[PDB]
Amino acid sequence: TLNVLADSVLMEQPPLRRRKLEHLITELVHQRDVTRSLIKSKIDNAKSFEWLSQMRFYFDPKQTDVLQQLSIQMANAKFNYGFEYLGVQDKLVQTPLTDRCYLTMTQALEARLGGSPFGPAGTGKTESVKALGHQLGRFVLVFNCDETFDFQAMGRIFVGLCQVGAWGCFDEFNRLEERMLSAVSQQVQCIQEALREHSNPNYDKTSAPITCELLNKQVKVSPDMAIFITMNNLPDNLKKLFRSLAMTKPDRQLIAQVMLYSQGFRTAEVLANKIVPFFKLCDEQLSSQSHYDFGLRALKSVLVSAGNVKRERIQKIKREIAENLPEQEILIQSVCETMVPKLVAEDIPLLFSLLSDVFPGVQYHRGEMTALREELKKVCQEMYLTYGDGEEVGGMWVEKVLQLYQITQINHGLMMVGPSGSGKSMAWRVLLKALERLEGVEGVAHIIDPKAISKDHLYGTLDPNTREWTDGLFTHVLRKIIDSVRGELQKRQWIVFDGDVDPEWVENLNSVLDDNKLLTLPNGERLSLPPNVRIMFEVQDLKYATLATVSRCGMVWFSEDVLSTDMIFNNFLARLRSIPLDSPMLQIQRDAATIMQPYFTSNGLVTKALEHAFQLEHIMDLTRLRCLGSLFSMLHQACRNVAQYNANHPDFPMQIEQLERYIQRYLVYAILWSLSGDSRLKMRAELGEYIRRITTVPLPTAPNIPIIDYEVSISGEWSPWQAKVPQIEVETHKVAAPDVVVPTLDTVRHEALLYTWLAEHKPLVLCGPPGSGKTMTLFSALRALPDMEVVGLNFSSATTPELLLKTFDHYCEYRRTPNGVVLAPVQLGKWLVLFCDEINLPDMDKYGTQRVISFIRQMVEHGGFYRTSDQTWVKLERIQFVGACNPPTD
Amino acid sequence: EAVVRLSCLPAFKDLIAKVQADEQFGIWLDSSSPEQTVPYLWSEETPATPIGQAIHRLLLIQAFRPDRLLAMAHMFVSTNLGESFMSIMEQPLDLTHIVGTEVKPNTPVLMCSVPGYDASGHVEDLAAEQNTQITSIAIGSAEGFNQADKAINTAVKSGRWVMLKNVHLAPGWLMQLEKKLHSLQPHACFRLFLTMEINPKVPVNLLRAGRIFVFEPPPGVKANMLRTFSSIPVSRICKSPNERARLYFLLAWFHAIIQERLRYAPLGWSKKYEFGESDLRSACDTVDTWLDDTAKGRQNISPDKIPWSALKTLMAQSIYGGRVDNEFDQRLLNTFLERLFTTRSFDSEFKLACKVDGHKDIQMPDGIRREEFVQWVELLPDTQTPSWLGLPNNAERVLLTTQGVDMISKMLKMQAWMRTLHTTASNWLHLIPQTLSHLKRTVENIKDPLFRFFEREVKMGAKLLQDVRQDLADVVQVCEGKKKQTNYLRTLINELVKGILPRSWSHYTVPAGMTVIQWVSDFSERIKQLQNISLAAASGGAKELKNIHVCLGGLFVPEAYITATRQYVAQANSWSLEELCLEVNVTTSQGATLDACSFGVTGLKLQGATCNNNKLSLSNAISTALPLTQLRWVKQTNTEKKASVVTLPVYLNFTRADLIFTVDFEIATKEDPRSFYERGVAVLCT
Amino acid sequence: FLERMNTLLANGEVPGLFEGDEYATLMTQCKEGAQKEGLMLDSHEELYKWFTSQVIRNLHVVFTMNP
Amino acid sequence: EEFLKQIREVWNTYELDLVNYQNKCRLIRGWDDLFNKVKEHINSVSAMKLSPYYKVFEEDALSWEDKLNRIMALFDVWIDVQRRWVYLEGIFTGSADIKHLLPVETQRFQSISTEFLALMKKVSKSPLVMDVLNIQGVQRSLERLADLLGKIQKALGEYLERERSSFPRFYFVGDEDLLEIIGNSKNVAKLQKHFKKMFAGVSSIILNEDNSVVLGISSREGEEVMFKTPVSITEHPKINEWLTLVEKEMRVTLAKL
Numbered sequence A: 001t002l003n004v005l006a007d008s009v010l011m012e013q014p015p016l017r018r019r020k021l022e023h024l025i026t027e028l029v030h031q032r033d034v035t036r037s038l039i040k041s042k043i044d045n046a047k048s049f050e051w052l053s054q055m056r057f058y059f060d061p062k063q064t065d066v067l068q069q070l071s072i073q074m075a076n077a078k079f080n081y082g083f084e085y086l087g088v089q090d091k092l093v094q095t096p097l098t099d100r101c102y103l104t105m106t107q108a109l110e111a112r113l114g115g116s117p118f119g120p121a122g123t124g125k126t127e128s129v130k131a132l133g134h135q136l137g138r139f140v141l142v143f144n145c146d147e148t149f150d151f152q153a154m155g156r157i158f159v160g161l162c163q164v165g166a167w168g169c170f171d172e173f174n175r176l177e178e179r180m181l182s183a184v185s186q187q188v189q190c191i192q193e194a195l196r197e198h199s200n201p202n203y204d205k206t207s208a209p210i211t212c213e214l215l216n217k218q219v220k221v222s223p224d225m226a227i228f229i230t231m232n233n234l235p236d237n238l239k240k241l242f243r244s245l246a247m248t249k250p251d252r253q254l255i256a257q258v259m260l261y262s263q264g265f266r267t268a269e270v271l272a273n274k275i276v277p278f279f280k281l282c283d284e285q286l287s288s289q290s291h292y293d294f295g296l297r298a299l300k301s302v303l304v305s306a307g308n309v310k311r312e313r314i315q316k317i318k319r320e321i322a323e324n325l326p327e328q329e330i331l332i333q334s335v336c337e338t339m340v341p342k343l344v345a346e347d348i349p350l351l352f353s354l355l356s357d358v359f360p361g362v363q364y365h366r367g368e369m370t371a372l373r374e375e376l377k378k379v380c381q382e383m384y385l386t387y388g389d390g391e392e393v394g395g396m397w398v399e400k401v402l403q404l405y406q407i408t409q410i411n412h413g414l415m416m417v418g419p420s421g422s423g424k425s426m427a428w429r430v431l432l433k434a435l436e437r438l439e440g441v442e443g444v445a446h447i448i449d450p451k452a453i454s455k456d457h458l459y460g461t462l463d464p465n466t467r468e469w470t471d472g473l474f475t476h477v478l479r480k481i482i483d484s485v486r487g488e489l490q491k492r493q494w495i496v497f498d499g500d501v502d503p504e505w506v507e508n509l510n511s512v513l514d515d516n517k518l519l520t521l522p523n524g525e526r527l528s529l530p531p532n533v534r535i536m537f538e539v540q541d542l543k544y545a546t547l548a549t550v551s552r553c554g555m556v557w558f559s560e561d562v563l564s565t566d567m568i569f570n571n572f573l574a575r576l577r578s579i580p581l582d583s584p585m586l587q588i589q590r591d592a593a594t595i596m597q598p599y600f601t602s603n604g605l606v607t608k609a610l611e612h613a614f615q616l617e618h619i620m621d622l623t624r625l626r627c628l629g630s631l632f633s634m635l636h637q638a639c640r641n642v643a644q645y646n647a648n649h650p651d652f653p654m655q656i657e658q659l660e661r662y663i664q665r666y667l668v669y670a671i672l673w674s675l676s677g678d679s680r681l682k683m684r685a686e687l688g689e690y691i692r693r694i695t696t697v698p699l700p701t702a703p704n705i706p707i708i709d710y711e712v713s714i715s716g717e718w719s720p721w722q723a724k725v726p727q728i729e730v731e732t733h734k735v736a737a738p739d740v741v742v743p744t745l746d747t748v749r750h751e752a753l754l755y756t757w758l759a760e761h762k763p764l765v766l767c768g769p770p771g772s773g774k775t776m777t778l779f780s781a782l783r784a785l786p787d788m789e790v791v792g793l794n795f796s797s798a799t800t801p802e803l804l805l806k807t808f809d810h811y812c813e814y815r816r817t818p819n820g821v822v823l824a825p826v827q828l829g830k831w832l833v834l835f836c837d838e839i840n841l842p843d844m845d846k847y848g849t850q851r852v853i854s855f856i857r858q859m860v861e862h863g864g865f866y867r868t869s870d871q872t873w874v875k876l877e878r879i880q881f882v883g884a885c886n887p888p889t890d
Numbered sequence B: 001e002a003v004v005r006l007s008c009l010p011a012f013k014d015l016i017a018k019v020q021a022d023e024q025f026g027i028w029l030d031s032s033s034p035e036q037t038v039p040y041l042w043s044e045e046t047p048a049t050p051i052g053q054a055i056h057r058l059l060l061i062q063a064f065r066p067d068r069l070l071a072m073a074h075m076f077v078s079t080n081l082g083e084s085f086m087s088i089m090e091q092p093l094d095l096t097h098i099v100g101t102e103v104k105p106n107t108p109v110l111m112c113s114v115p116g117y118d119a120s121g122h123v124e125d126l127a128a129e130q131n132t133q134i135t136s137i138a139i140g141s142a143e144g145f146n147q148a149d150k151a152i153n154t155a156v157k158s159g160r161w162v163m164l165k166n167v168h169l170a171p172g173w174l175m176q177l178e179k180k181l182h183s184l185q186p187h188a189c190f191r192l193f194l195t196m197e198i199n200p201k202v203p204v205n206l207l208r209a210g211r212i213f214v215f216e217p218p219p220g221v222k223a224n225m226l227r228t229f230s231s232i233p234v235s236r237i238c239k240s241p242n243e244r245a246r247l248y249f250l251l252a253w254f255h256a257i258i259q260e261r262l263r264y265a266p267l268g269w270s271k272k273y274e275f276g277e278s279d280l281r282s283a284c285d286t287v288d289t290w291l292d293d294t295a296k297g298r299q300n301i302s303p304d305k306i307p308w309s310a311l312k313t314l315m316a317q318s319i320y321g322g323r324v325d326n327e328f329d330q331r332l333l334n335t336f337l338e339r340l341f342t343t344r345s346f347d348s349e350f351k352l353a354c355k356v357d358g359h360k361d362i363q364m365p366d367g368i369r370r371e372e373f374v375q376w377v378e379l380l381p382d383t384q385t386p387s388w389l390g391l392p393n394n395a396e397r398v399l400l401t402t403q404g405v406d407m408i409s410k411m412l413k414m415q416a417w418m419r420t421l422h423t424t425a426s427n428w429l430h431l432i433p434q435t436l437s438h439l440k441r442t443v444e445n446i447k448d449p450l451f452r453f454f455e456r457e458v459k460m461g462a463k464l465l466q467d468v469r470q471d472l473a474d475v476v477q478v479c480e481g482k483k484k485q486t487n488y489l490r491t492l493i494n495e496l497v498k499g500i501l502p503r504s505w506s507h508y509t510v511p512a513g514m515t516v517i518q519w520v521s522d523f524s525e526r527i528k529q530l531q532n533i534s535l536a537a538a539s540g541g542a543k544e545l546k547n548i549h550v551c552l553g554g555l556f557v558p559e560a561y562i563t564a565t566r567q568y569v570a571q572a573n574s575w576s577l578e579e580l581c582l583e584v585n586v587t588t589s590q591g592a593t594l595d596a597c598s599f600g601v602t603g604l605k606l607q608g609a610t611c612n613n614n615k616l617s618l619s620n621a622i623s624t625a626l627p628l629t630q631l632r633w634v635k636q637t638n639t640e641k642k643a644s645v646v647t648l649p650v651y652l653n654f655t656r657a658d659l660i661f662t663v664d665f666e667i668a669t670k671e672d673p674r675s676f677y678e679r680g681v682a683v684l685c686t
Numbered sequence C: 001f002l003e004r005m006n007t008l009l010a011n012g013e014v015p016g017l018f019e020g021d022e023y024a025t026l027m028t029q030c031k032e033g034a035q036k037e038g039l040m041l042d043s044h045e046e047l048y049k050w051f052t053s054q055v056i057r058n059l060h061v062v063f064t065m066n067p
Numbered sequence D: 001e002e003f004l005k006q007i008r009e010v011w012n013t014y015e016l017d018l019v020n021y022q023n024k025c026r027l028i029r030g031w032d033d034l035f036n037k038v039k040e041h042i043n044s045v046s047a048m049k050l051s052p053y054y055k056v057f058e059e060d061a062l063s064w065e066d067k068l069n070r071i072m073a074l075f076d077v078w079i080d081v082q083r084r085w086v087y088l089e090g091i092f093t094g095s096a097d098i099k100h101l102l103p104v105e106t107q108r109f110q111s112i113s114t115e116f117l118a119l120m121k122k123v124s125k126s127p128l129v130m131d132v133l134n135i136q137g138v139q140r141s142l143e144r145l146a147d148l149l150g151k152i153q154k155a156l157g158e159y160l161e162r163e164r165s166s167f168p169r170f171y172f173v174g175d176e177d178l179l180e181i182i183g184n185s186k187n188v189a190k191l192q193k194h195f196k197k198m199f200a201g202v203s204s205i206i207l208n209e210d211n212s213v214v215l216g217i218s219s220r221e222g223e224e225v226m227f228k229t230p231v232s233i234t235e236h237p238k239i240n241e242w243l244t245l246v247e248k249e250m251r252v253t254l255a256k257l
């Protein structure tokens, strides 16, 4: 029978028949083991315990009542099959630990006692109870204790258990809070005392019905019911009423072997003996991260994927017996395809080292995927992006995109975790457009920040009295996609949750990211996620998320090593060469990029300055892209200066030599003012000295005055800031007045810097000690320009985005005429700058994030936000942000 | 080392010449009771007072043979507080006078009992002898609350007594009871008894407001067997075939054995399992059911027809083994069941316990009825050594040493800190060896897994060394008030002054109840070892890292070392991990040459046995230090292990809570593996 | 409670306290104050500036602490 | 003296905000602010009869504490009757089979809802807070409204408990879920979403073209079991009885297979 089953499973079979085949193989392997070993060791009596210990089945079809047709016996315990329909459930591998569990639990049930399979997590305790219940044909309910617990449901569930005669298993009883733990312990004590008195030796013939006290009423207790309490000690009430069992070490070497044999693998024993310790080392040798999972569930997922891969390979070979495959190669390829995407870049060589150690001489080849690889090349080229294959520049990022696409095929509910500064958003954007251009199906992505809006605004609220439901943002998007009023089906819809994750706003999400794919609204409506909608979680750290959400998502880890600095320089140079800052301007940009090309190399001036600036001390945590983007924006402003000088002099414009000198000097100035521009004077002087040491461009020759106090003039020569500061004579009535700002070397430097960084409209923050003069330099500089309005917002410790919304309502207006709703200031031609001092002051929530800061991040990176009035994306125009704050150490 | 510390006292400065000069000292060490005759060793110009003599001999007993420290503490108390100070405690508690007078009716009488014992019998037969009825009530049920309320109201109005049993299930209602009792109670003869088990959910205010009585099961196989036979009623024993009485006697013996091996927690049962009365009742029910099944009638049935396999399996996997988690305790329990529950148990030549007191044996009683077995039980001699249980006779000795250390800790727990904190911190900074650097992370020879495990080891070692040095420097700076003190430093100094190791310092597995001094000394040894590793790696590289006599106690995660050694052996000769098996060779040389697969280990300690030429032999002495241990990994030959080897466990510390790996040791031909299993022989990393 | 002093001490006014009907009542009382002093409607923002100047010249808030 | 004048002007100009509910009536919104204002005012008067200047204004303060006690006694039961009436309206209007199963309770609710709609119209005419207190017999009206809604809710709870007793697998579904099951017996499409919590592996039932006899059961993955003797819903119209025949016939057909 096993040979026939193994021959049949290798062929192509429908999934339900495949599951039936797998279950039959598992049971027949268990039967073969039992008969071969535990019965053939010189046993000849049917009453010997070596056979009575096994789970024996007796079928009597002459009995009239259906519940007594089949009797199930193990040891001295007798049960009647309840004949409950179970559909098709997962059948566990019957390891000797499972045999011991079955023996102990049936012994406890025979004595009308409870079962307590205590032990560590992931050892198979709840699954063992469920499998025992299904073997006897009993309905088994699992009461998860992960804060998804209540009294109103649980009491009536106990009543229903006692009435119908089903089984109740608690996933982890000790995790309940003390009061709930005590109350449920009281209820289980009552039910178990009812069960114990049911088998009273003097009252074996139960004439009066066995009844217990539940819900302050008398409830009949069925004798087929049982309560199972799974631990990780037992309450004093139930110590004498439950039989404990230690389920600590599951026999993984046997589970893996039987599962691989059921998958068609002929060398299941060797493959299991290699894969179990390999996962042990992966648990041990690899670094400890929250998202890693090397338990038995992940092991089963890997073996199932390996079986699917082997079957697909057999199908490919046939369409071109077939037994000579490299089984080890299939297993290692499956392990890599499942585990590599969620691995930190440091742990990748370690994973291949363990692979070489456990699996000697077998190598992994990734899928070429040339059909989509060319499309990715094209989309990267049209986005001025950097593209690469394998070891060349950009290989890691393209591989990461391929892993994201693979996991997108595998399952919905994506989660791309990567430190800020990695290629996360670009990866899925390029993937979306490449899929659109390849498969011909249009892709639409909705960007949602879950922290910019509240849970009630995100999911919808129910009126306290009216019972009217107004849908939230995510709910409205899902309803719009499902309704298909415009045709959002046959189109790849991606709901990307840009931001971070915490256990609050994902409470209603756990019901859809899993296999259920169902969103349950508290009004009663239920929404089913259509197959063409994928939900992604573009997060940064993944440090405040429950394991429940993490385990339900396929995951790609975007390490900072993925996005190399040469790639940033290539993107910047391509954008400068192609995207104008507004043809003569674009010609100027081409020239400037040509001069600055030798400096933006792998071991150029900028890279060495960057690697120095990291070891310095900065007031805020240095991020590579923050300083790089500041540097690029200042270079754009340089191109703007060159264009303005050319416009000022229509005859004799900027020549090649003068332009070269100016751009060289300004790039040095921009390295000084962008790298360590937020540090003390000593750090600035140290960076200036290092740059003087390394570079070859000429610098100011004065050995006393440092370069930070110098400037470059439009003529291409270093000039002092002291020469540009004017001498002012304020009136007597305005001596030391609130608004009087005396120009000084600092004031003029930061004035030019502020003009530079508001030319391209980056939000900036002057961070400094109290009394330095941020709040006054800012107002002077902003009010200097004539097309700028300034609104001063003072962020308190309780600041919320509602303040920003009120500011917008007071000063701006909503306009519908263009493609989308646009939020613009009421006055025309004036750019509204929002002063935000004490920007770091608003309090972080319980999960390490700032609501208003996330809101500003969404409005700055994406250019708009979602309004909660009618859930549409409003786009910002003619609005800027400016910040100021004291140092975080304060 | 103990006599080195003890000599620091001025009266003990010449202890060295004193111990060399005396020749009868050696026979004083192996004496059964050295506290009775302690030789005069202290040097003092003035004759020491009886009290001073007692103190000096007590210090000597702490130095030499600290196991008799409890007996010598008894002697010291007798010589200071007078003889027969604890004599009344040994006598049975007579709460007739205590209930009559000395206890006001307002104050409840609390009867706290160790889990697995009852206390209602003493108060019950006291009520029987004094002729005063009591309303016994169980508190487990909901109606028990108002039943107790009405009963105590009736008693206060009338003058009778009230019993409340197992009241530890309702802490809050105990608080309410205490509040209600705080009111004046009119009648003087009212007495309220609260039968209780020792449980810390019980409110403190009730404990302060009542008289506490602690009851414990008397120690001894005889007492436990009497309690078991008394609990089981006579009708259950003398029914059905007479072979049942012997079966229950066997089961009671097994219960008595595996309950008293609990008291020797690390040597004998690893952990403190429950093994309560519920397991006893379940085992009795199983025996009764299976004997009814196999023997339908009343007539006596042959011992070979007893379902022995059924009883052994159900008491090794379902009963008494459900709470057993680790493999070796299960192996011990199976050994005990196989030795006891067998058809050979029904002959007259059965030996329940062998090797008792060297040569004596506990002969199986030749009885058929319950009465003969009981009378055999009361005839057990009082001289019960641990050899009855299978443990070696020095198991009581290590237990007494543990109790002595616990008493010292308890005395310390119940005893201006600027200067002492400063001096201890300065000695610690002098003790710990500065800091080591990460002289690691080389691109070449990165395939070496030992090398990588040494990156990781040195990495977190230096991180936490820097952390502890920063904390110590900070507390030193705050000691002279040179800087501000924070909340983290508040917790840290509070933990240091209390003598408990800081939680932020324990980045590695630590024995339970470790004081800071030995933690920092162990830390110093680990850091010195890591500096040796780092210097060796710098001098030679990855190849020389293999030839290190590394000590697994000093490693934070020895199992990671074992795995890394497996990877190193497998990478050479192009082998896989599944095909490598561990073989242990014990060699006398501390610096013996290692071949391509041998790795040196130092500091492993063997308890209960001595190793010679890779052959084990049972020995009374414990902590037989192994000179050097080569771990070799060879290709598995796929052969069955012979019956002359044992799979010993290798724990990390003396508290056998964590397992590192297993060793296959060949034993001498005269012993058997079962005796090794029962005596708790094990290998310890530290 | 703090940092609301800081805004009215660095600049002399707290902009978050005055919105809607409260702001309108402030402007009406600023009318009354300007009329007592001798000024006219001018502009509402100019009235707010005069309010801020009067707060700067008149308000002296004292807050005490223990070392 | 001034405090009393602002209290006079705030309770003379206080307006009850009303919001439309399914184009049926205009219900009170703003319970929290009203309750907070009334509580703060009563606490402030309780502060003032304690003041030494209370003797000159003793009669006015007494009249005002009387009116505030009345206004709280009115709205504290008004919010309750609001909540119960909305609950009962939603459960007695969202389904059509609830009329048959509880006819007398349905008639009682129709009467009480007709009265409540009349009161809502009458209060919508003049939502001025005072104009709401001076209306004839408002207190006894709301008292009997609340009492009748309470007895109807208790009878409903007893009916659901009886329904649970008849079919013991209804205990697994919630009160709202069971109410939806019983009130929607005619249409089985919304029944099939509840089968995954009552039964073990059954996720749906396969019926006729007209949904008359239960052909069989289907699991979550599409695996189907065919009843040897299909059970007729038309012969056993009550939900519990034909569900019991479904479970029994499922057990019998599994036994035969």
Ligand SMILES: Nc1ncnc2c1ncn2[C@@H]1O[C@H](COP(=O)(O)OP(=O)(O)NP(=O)(O)O)[C@@H](O)[C@H]1O
Pocket: A740, A741, A742, A743, A744, A747, A768, A769, A770, A771, A772, A773, A774, A775, A776, A777, A837, A886, C010
């Ligand atoms: N150019 C300048 N002209 C006049 N006063 C100046 C100038 N630069 C600095 N000051 C003085 O320096 C102080 C700066 O005050 P302020 O603008 O509040 O700085 P601030 O640091 O942003 N305040 P804070 O938010 O608490 O840090 C005032 O006392 C000014 O008078």
Ligand SMILES: Nc1ncnc2c1ncn2[C@@H]1O[C@H](COP(=O)(O)OP(=O)(O)OP(=O)(O)O)[C@@H](O)[C@H]1O
Pocket: A385, A386, A387, A394, A397, A418, A419, A420, A421, A422, A423, A424, A425, A426, A427, A538, A540, A563, A567, A568, A571, A625
């Ligand atoms: N090949 C590339 N792939 C991705 N980004 C690239 C590439 N070459 C250059 N870049 C630049 O690197 C940056 C990548 O930012 P991206 O939006 O992908 O990061 P993110 O992780 O989503 O953002 P955050 O920093 O907020 O976490 C952009 O500035 C982009 O222009």
Ligand SMILES: Nc1ncnc2c1ncn2[C@@H]1O[C@H](COP(=O)(O)OP(=O)(O)O)[C@@H](O)[C@H]1O
Pocket: A091, A092, A093, A094, A095, A098, A119, A120, A121, A122, A123, A124, A125, A126, A127, A128, A230, A250, A255, A296, A297, A300
């Ligand atoms: N005997 C077994 N055969 C096959 N798989 C098992 C077995 N025992 C446990 N598992 C697997 O282990 C996983 C987790 O088991 P679980 O019951 O969650 O453990 P715990 O109760 O400790 O959390 C399950 O997905 C199950 O598939």
Ligand SMILES: [Mg+2]
Pocket: A121, A122
């Ligand atoms: Mg689990």
Ligand SMILES: [Mg+2]
Pocket: A424, A425, A426, A538
């Ligand atoms: Mg992004």
Ligand SMILES: [Mg+2]
Pocket: A774, A775, A776, A837, C010
């Ligand atoms: Mg400021």
